Amino acid sequence: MSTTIEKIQRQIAENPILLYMKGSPKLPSCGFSAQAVQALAACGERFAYVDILQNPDIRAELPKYANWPTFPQLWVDGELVGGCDIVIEMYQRGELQQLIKETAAKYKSEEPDAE
């Protein structure tokens, strides 16, 4: 199929906790993700993130595969949650870290992200 999404899906799936945002050297979230990134790290533990508002190719095709025209978009166990607003809301909800915790714990050690 698409000579990048196939790779990307393998990548999203492999990463325990994944976040797509813009990884500018000055700011590793140069977009909307700027507010969301804070929430994720705040709610759970450490997470993996992919620069995409910066990469032209990846920015276009891959987001469309999940839902969004582009990003930010948050992925838990390689499954889309939502990047900009969704992260903040679910952050406040607590459910985000609930997912992250369980996912992080099952992928790594006893990651006590949420609790």
CATH number of the domain at 1-108, please?
3.40.30.10
Burial class (CB in 10 A: 0-12, 13-18, 19+), 103: buried
Structural contact between residues 21 and 83, judged by C-beta atoms closer than 8 angstroms:
yes
Domain ranges of the chain: 1-108
What per-residue string of b and e applies to 72-98 under the rule 16 or more CB within 10 Å gives b? bbbbbbbebbbbbebbbebbeeeebbb
The one-letter amino acid code at 23 reads: G
Beta bridge partners of 17: 76
Q: Are strands 48-51 and 17-21 parallel, antiparallel or unpaired?
A: parallel
What DSSP string runs through 3-21?
TTHHHHHHHHHHSSEEEEE
This entry's atomic model was obtained through NMR
Q: Which residues does the annotation place in the binding site?
A: 22, 30, 59, 71, 84-85
Q: Which residues does the annotation place in the binding site for glutathione?
A: 22, 59, 71, 84-85
3-state secondary structure 78-102: CEECCCCHHHHHHHHHCHHHHHHHH
Q: Which residues does the annotation place in the binding site for [2Fe-2S] cluster?
A: 30
Beta bridge partners of 49: 19
